[PDB]
Design a protein around this ligand. Structure first.
Ligand code: PLM
Ligand code: PLM
Ligand code: FE2
Ligand code: FE2
Ligand code: FE2
Ligand code: FE2
Ligand code: MN
Ligand code: MN
Lengths: 272, 284
């Protein structure tokens, strides 16, 4: 049951950080994947040899599944914060979820346009990828339906925002630009990546805000955050190692970028 | 756990009716409540007598709570359809949810701008209003976390889309225009209402699609739909009667602005909306 409503008893908290992020999301998140011209991407893909075609698919497989997972798996966080009365967080999260919908749409439109929509790309998800995206991510989010404790919320935001988005996805954009911008390939996909990267800046800000406001209640939660980050590292690097070996471009450059992002995300939360 | 992912094994179903509705939502849902000029609304509200100021508040109280309720209460539907693998429905529902956020924001910005943000408007929710919005709506939606049966989904879409949006809110837009557009008052609120009404057409279409696809599986569910509509009517009309009674006890705004407010035409619009929603679902 609803006890009452914040915008009847009072108003939105106009100064709340998540209301301010919501306002930014509306002003900056206007792109439509349906407007991207993928016609040259189709011709670029056809120009590749069979071996070069295969080389591009593991990264796309990781992104399509990843965007689909985050579209579905943010819903428990929205529910948990709604149940806690965090209205401004909920408003922001409507933009987060609509951003992810666009991300899923974008990669799927690319697959369709280049002629691989009919190909099952699941073959490029190894055990480490599945441990994160098929298992750990939905487990941590769904937990929030029955357990919205600080510990549960930190774990959810750690897996979702700091690892999935802040480590793997961030490193994926970089990788795609290092390879394909340089090769002059897939301009429509790279335009989509640029819009997506802008959206995801907001998503990471929500994760940092959420983790830090809980850590501020108790430094014991800081140690939980670091432990959950380290818990998932073997799977992050296990997936990275798998893509790197498929790749055979400076792969050690890309690998160190992943490590850089992982340590960066840790440093964006303060014990204090 | 996720078994796999549709956009890895295949693609989005580009022809799915809810993918098409999602596409329309992106194209047509561009407005931003933060861009509405409420400065004239502020002046209008201040120029009103206390007894004219009051006349508008019961309707605004109904919409602010309603929009906040639907913002929160759509989440279980999105979850239930997601768990069923209905990806295109989920994509569309992201636009539904972000629409509702804008609707909550819009009415809250109006209240803030006109100087009533600090006033507790709960006093204009009677028992019938509370049975719909404080109780029946969240109960029917939350049910979906543990019971996503066809019966549960039809009941959820009936309460949310056909009654709350398709009968009450639709009648509220009409009432607001019948009163304040003719008066020449609250231009920013009216702009917001117009944007909102456009969004809500899609929300009702989602409800029709959802109910109809379940009725298509088994025509027995059509009688469930009709029954659930009829179960809620006493509270729809109980709330309408309450707002009508309030409006008839304060007629200064109508006298001042020469509006022959026909509450019996509004009451008949509510009845028309209710019966019209029923006709939009067919047995076969
Ligand atoms: C060889 C260098 C490895 C680079 C790492 C590539 C990782 C693939 C990215 C897939 C994760 C996508 C998750 C979506 C998160 C979001 O968009 O919010
Ligand atoms: C005197 C005529 C009575 C007219 C009825 C007024 C009803 C007020 C509307 C409040 C419900 C708002 C619910 C929001 C639903 C949505 O926008 O999705
Ligand atoms: Fe994201
Ligand atoms: Fe391994
Ligand atoms: Fe709606
Ligand atoms: Fe009554
Ligand atoms: Mn994304
Ligand atoms: Mn609405």
């Amino acid at each position: 049951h609803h006890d009452g409503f914040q915008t009847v008893k009072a108003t939105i908290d106009w100064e709340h950080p998540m209301f301010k992020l919501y306002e930014k999301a509306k002003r900056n998140g206007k792109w439509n994947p349906a407007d991207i011209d993928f016609s040259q991407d189709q011709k670029d893909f056809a120009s590749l040899t069979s071996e070069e075609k295969i080389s591009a698919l593991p990264l796309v497989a990781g992104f399509s599944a990843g965007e689909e997972a985050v579209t579905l798996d943010i819903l428990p966080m929205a529910h948990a914060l709604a149940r806690q009365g965090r209205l401004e967080d909920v408003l922001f999260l409507t933009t987060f979820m609509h951003d992810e919908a666009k991300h899923v749409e974008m990669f799927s439109r690319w697959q369709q346009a280049v002629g691989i929509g009919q190909m099952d790309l699941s073959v490029f998800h190894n055990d480490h990828y599945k441990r994160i995206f098929y298992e750990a991510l939905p487990e941590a989010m769904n937990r929030l339906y029955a357990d919205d404790s600080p510990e549960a919320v930190i774990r959810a935001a750690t897996v979702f925002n700091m690892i999935v988005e802040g480590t793997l996805a961030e490193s994926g954009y970089y990788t795609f630009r290092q390879i394909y911008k340089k090769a002059g390939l897939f301009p429509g996909l790279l335009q989509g990546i640029d819009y997506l990267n802008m959206d995801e800046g907001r998503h990471i800000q929500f994760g940092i805000y959420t983790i830090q406001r809980i850590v501020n209640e108790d430094e014991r939660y800081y140690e939980l955050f670091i432990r959950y980050m380290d818990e998932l590292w073997p799977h992050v690097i296990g997936y990275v190692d798998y893509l790197t070996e498929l790749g055979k471009i400076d792969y050690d450059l890309l690998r160190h970028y992943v490590i850089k992002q992982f340590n960066l995300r840790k440093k964006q939360i303060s014990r204090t």
